[PDB]
Scaffold this active site. Structure first.
Site, PDB file in Angstrom:
ATOM      1  N   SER A   1       0.493  12.058  10.020  1.00  0.00           N
ATOM      2  CA  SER A   1      -0.256  11.681   8.652  1.00  0.00           C
ATOM      3  C   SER A   1      -0.414  10.304   8.341  1.00  0.00           C
ATOM      4  O   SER A   1      -1.199   9.810   7.934  1.00  0.00           O
ATOM      5  CB  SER A   1       0.503  12.415   7.531  1.00  0.00           C
ATOM      6  OG  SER A   1      -0.128  12.706   6.388  1.00  0.00           O
ATOM      7  N   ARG A   2       0.913   9.572   8.676  1.00  0.00           N
ATOM      8  CA  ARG A   2       0.856   8.176   8.677  1.00  0.00           C
ATOM      9  C   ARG A   2      -0.348   7.485   9.543  1.00  0.00           C
ATOM     10  O   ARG A   2      -0.946   6.809   9.155  1.00  0.00           O
ATOM     11  CB  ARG A   2       2.168   7.517   9.321  1.00  0.00           C
ATOM     12  CG  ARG A   2       3.403   7.936   8.313  1.00  0.00           C
ATOM     13  CD  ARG A   2       4.509   7.370   8.425  1.00  0.00           C
ATOM     14  NE  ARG A   2       5.187   7.656   9.691  1.00  0.00           N
ATOM     15  CZ  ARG A   2       6.080   8.336  10.231  1.00  0.00           C
ATOM     16  NH1 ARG A   2       6.516   9.278   9.143  1.00  0.00           N
ATOM     17  NH2 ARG A   2       6.404   8.734  11.407  1.00  0.00           N
TER      18      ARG A   2
ATOM     19  N   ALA B   1       6.354  11.709   5.174  1.00  0.00           N
ATOM     20  CA  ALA B   1       7.353  12.024   6.442  1.00  0.00           C
ATOM     21  C   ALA B   1       6.800  12.450   7.901  1.00  0.00           C
ATOM     22  O   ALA B   1       7.744  12.848   8.824  1.00  0.00           O
ATOM     23  CB  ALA B   1       8.247  12.941   5.937  1.00  0.00           C
ATOM     24  N   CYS B   2       5.438  12.379   8.074  1.00  0.00           N
ATOM     25  CA  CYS B   2       4.603  12.922   9.342  1.00  0.00           C
ATOM     26  C   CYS B   2       4.158  11.840   9.888  1.00  0.00           C
ATOM     27  O   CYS B   2       3.301  11.251   9.476  1.00  0.00           O
ATOM     28  CB  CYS B   2       3.844  14.176   8.859  1.00  0.00           C
ATOM     29  SG  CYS B   2       2.908  14.650  10.184  1.00  0.00           S
ATOM     30  N   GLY B   3       4.335  11.654  11.193  1.00  0.00           N
ATOM     31  CA  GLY B   3       3.825  10.327  12.025  1.00  0.00           C
ATOM     32  C   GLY B   3       2.124  10.918  11.929  1.00  0.00           C
ATOM     33  O   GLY B   3       1.436   9.812  11.926  1.00  0.00           O
TER      34      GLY B   3
END
Ligand SMILES: O=S([O-])[O-]
Ligand SMILES: [Cs+]
Ligand SMILES: [Cs+]
Ligand SMILES: [Cs+]
Ligand SMILES: [Cs+]
Ligand SMILES: [Cs+]
Length: 138
Positions: A13-14, A9-11
């Site tokens: 992290s993506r 859910a974290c940009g």
């Protein structure tokens, strides 16, 4: 041999996960919210990251707010135990590679510890360019 403690859910992290893939390896993915590190592992991560325990705390999440952790009244081990009992306090993503461990905030920090060069240009999902096709950092 790469491991990422990932929050889908974290940009940040993506983007880190796609940069790892763009160096040519598929990392082991640990959904830390569900499968947090053990105390021993978390202590090791922190030592390898060379950051303070408190610098790993994510602000602006319910246990940080309700447990009062903004205030300087907690020892490092009390903060490690809060992180283990409330894994959303662990900031993200943490990446481990054979070259070292980093809290990849911002995501391009991961370029420090990836052994192989990005295989082509990389642009973050909001359009921020990170490396061009030639491999130069922008
Ligand atoms: O992404 S920030 O809100 O931790
Ligand atoms: Cs590879
Ligand atoms: Cs574990
Ligand atoms: Cs809750
Ligand atoms: Cs590197
Ligand atoms: Cs962003």
């Amino acid at each position: 041999n790469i491991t990422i403690y990932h929050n889908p859910a974290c940009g940040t992290s993506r983007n880190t996960l796609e940069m790892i893939r763009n160096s040519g390896t598929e990392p082991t993915i640990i959904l830390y919210l569900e499968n947090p590190p053990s105390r021993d592992e978390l202590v090791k991560l922190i030592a390898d990251m060379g950051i303070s325990v408190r610098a790993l705390l994510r602000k602006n999440v319910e246990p940080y707010e309700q447990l009062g952790l903004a205030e300087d009244k907690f020892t490092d081990d009390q903060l490690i135990d809060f992180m283990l009992q409330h894994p959303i306090l662990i900031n993200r993503p943490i990446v481990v590679t054979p070259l070292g461990t980093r809290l990849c905030r911002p995501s391009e920090v991961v370029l420090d510890i990836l052994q192989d060069a990005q295989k082509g240009a990389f642009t973050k999902e909001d359009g921020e360019k990170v490396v061009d096709e030639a491999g130069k950092r922008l």
